[PDB]
């Protein structure tokens, strides 16, 4: 029965790991959106017919 108590101790650590990964995933989604937008900006600026004040 001591071992069953220890399993009770293990489950919380597994849950904490889940939580940390969720936070990381949220930040990652935001970062991927920002990277898409940055690609759009760089692509738009790669144009050689552009004015000096839009670059």
């Amino acid at each position: 029965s001591a071992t069953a108590a220890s399993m009770n101790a293990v489950k919380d650590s597994l849950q904490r790991g889940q939580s940390t990964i969720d936070v990381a995933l949220a930040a990652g989604d935001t970062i991927t959106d920002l990277l898409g937008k940055m690609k759009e900006k760089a692509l738009a600026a790669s144009d050689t017919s552009l004015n000096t004040a839009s670059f």
Partner: protein, 54 residues
């Protein structure tokens, strides 16, 4: 002399009409630059339009 002065007026007109044809400061009829490159692909590859000075 009258025909010569008419000729000279029309030449000055052509020059004015040519140098005023700019959109957003960039133009392909004055002769300022050799070509204009626009975007044509989501990776940067371009659509090239040479300059036709008039």
């Amino acid at each position: 002399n009258a025909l010569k002065s008419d000729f000279d007026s029309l030449r000055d007109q052509i020059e004015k009409a040519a140098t005023n044809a700019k959109f957003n400061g960039v133009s392909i009829a004055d002769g300022s630059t050799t070509k204009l490159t626009f975007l044509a692909n989501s990776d940067g590859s371009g659509f090239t339009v040479n300059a036709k000075t008039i």
